[PDB]
Amino acid sequence: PADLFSEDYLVDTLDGLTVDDQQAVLASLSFSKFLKHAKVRDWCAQAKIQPSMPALRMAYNYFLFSKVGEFIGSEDVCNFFVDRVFGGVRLLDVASVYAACSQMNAHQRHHICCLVERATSSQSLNPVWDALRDGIISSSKFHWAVKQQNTSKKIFSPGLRCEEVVKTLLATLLHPDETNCLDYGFMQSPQNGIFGVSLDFAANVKTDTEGRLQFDPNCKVYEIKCRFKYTFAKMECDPIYAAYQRLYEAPGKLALKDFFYSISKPAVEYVGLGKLPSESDYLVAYDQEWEACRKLTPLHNLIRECILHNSTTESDVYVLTDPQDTRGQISIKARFKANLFVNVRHSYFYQVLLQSSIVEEYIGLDSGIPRLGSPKYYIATGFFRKRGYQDPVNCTIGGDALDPHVEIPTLLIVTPVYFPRGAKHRLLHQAANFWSRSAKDTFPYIKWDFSYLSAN
Ligand SMILES: [Mg+2]
Numbered sequence: 001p002a003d004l005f006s007e008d009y010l011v012d013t014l015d016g017l018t019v020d021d022q023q024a025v026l027a028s029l030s031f032s033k034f035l036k037h038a039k040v041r042d043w044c045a046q047a048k049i050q051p052s053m054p055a056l057r058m059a060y061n062y063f064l065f066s067k068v069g070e071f072i073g074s075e076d077v078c079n080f081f082v083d084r085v086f087g088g089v090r091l092l093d094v095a096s097v098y099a100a101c102s103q104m105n106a107h108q109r110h111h112i113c114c115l116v117e118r119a120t121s122s123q124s125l126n127p128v129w130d131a132l133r134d135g136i137i138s139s140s141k142f143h144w145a146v147k148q149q150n151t152s153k154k155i156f157s158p159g160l161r162c163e164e165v166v167k168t169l170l171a172t173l174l175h176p177d178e179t180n181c182l183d184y185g186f187m188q189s190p191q192n193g194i195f196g197v198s199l200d201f202a203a204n205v206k207t208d209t210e211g212r213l214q215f216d217p218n219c220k221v222y223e224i225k226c227r228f229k230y231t232f233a234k235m236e237c238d239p240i241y242a243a244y245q246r247l248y249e250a251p252g253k254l255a256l257k258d259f260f261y262s263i264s265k266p267a268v269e270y271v272g273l274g275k276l277p278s279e280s281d282y283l284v285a286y287d288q289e290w291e292a293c294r295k296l297t298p299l300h301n302l303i304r305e306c307i308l309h310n311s312t313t314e315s316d317v318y319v320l321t322d323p324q325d326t327r328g329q330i331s332i333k334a335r336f337k338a339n340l341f342v343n344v345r346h347s348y349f350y351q352v353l354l355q356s357s358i359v360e361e362y363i364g365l366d367s368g369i370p371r372l373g374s375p376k377y378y379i380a381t382g383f384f385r386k387r388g389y390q391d392p393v394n395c396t397i398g399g400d401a402l403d404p405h406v407e408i409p410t411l412l413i414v415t416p417v418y419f420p421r422g423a424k425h426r427l428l429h430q431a432a433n434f435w436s437r438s439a440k441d442t443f444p445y446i447k448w449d450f451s452y453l454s455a456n
Pocket residue numbers: 163200223224225
């Protein structure tokens with residue numbers, strides 16, 4: 001194990017262990033192991049001590065980054081606590097660190113969370129990624145925290161190649177004339193410290209003077225998914241390929257339907273009037289033209305409201321050029337609208353819902369005159385094909401070369417997602433209640449004061 005309270009240098013702790021064992025040391029730097037440590041337990045045993053969120057999460061961030069900052073090359077987080085939060089003193093004990101963190105304002109917490117985001121922008125390549133995400137309801141767990149709450153996931157512990165291709169498509173083909181961000185770290189909520197997200201891609205988002213992210217009030221945020229069930233090869237007997245050929249030569253909604261229904265578990269579901277969508281995939285059609293063959297009750301009022309707000313703006317479909325024709329270049333061949341909409345019951349709806357809440361929280365804390373407009377949210381779905389013997393070695397999107405070991409993108413669908421306010425408020429409240437119950441049962445020796453948390 002590693003000691004967040006030890007004064008030993010992490011580089012020395014890790015020196016002389018296998019990479020396997022180093023991974024274990026780093027996993028031990030989690031919020032859960034922090035709260036389980038003898039020194040937190042001892043502090044928490046006192047009658048006067050009733051720890052609050054987000055203050056205890058801020059305290060953890062300090063100890064975490066004091067331990068790991070040098071190893072991951074970002075001493076900015078620790079410097080800020082010491083200089084701006086601790087009055088210039090290098091605090092080492094949990095009682096003092098906690099007290100000073102308890103005295104932070106929302107702009108200081110915002111600043112810390114922004115520095116942490118910047119320190120973690122390489123996401124799962126960063127050795128502290130897994131440890132930092134512990135104890136937090138992240139956007140990939142948000143549906144589970146609201147609707148499931150079972151042992152399929154945990155709050156506390158006490159593929160990527162194709163996603164990168166889709167980012168390149170968004171950046172190069174959809175937003176060539178704009179400032180975009182391709183690499184986002186982990187953004188904790190500065191107001192509660194129980195929620196957090198990382199984003200896949202955003203357009204109209206920049207680094208500011210020193211040296212954090214700036215979301216424009218009108219930025220465009222995209223969650224990227226890849227549909228591996230639809231990966232085909234240009235072979236004689238391949239039924240997906242058959243449907244793809246038709247779509248490529250004649251881009252439109254009918255060719256698209258045949259493509260969707262060329263597999264046994266289709267990504268699109270027809271949902272009739274007053275009927276409850278299943279959770280099976282994340283696109284739904286409300287028009288009978290997509291049919292190729294449970295009612296909403298009065299208690300599904302939140303679902304009804306979400307459908308109401310997600311049944312107007314259509315998806316954009318981008319058919320890409322085939323690099324077997326162009327010997328390399330992949331650009332937009334054709335573009336068309338499809339009456340396909342987000343499934344408001346699907347876990348991806350809940351994922352973007354939480355990313356919207358965190359993005360809007362950070363925009364709210366940003367200094368400056370508030371401007372007219374709110375950000376827009378999308379799911380960007382990529383579809384792919386195997387490389388064949390006659391495909392070029394070197395494919396490109398704009399300047400960017402594709403790794404020769406990644407599949408070729410064929411199709412991009414961009415689907416808008418809208419979030420009614422009352423609906424977001426209810427779901428975040430249920431998830432926060434589940435966080436609080438789970439914190440009390442997991443760390444029952446902590447006299448949690450959730451007064452501040454329920455204010456948020
Ligand atoms: Mg993604």
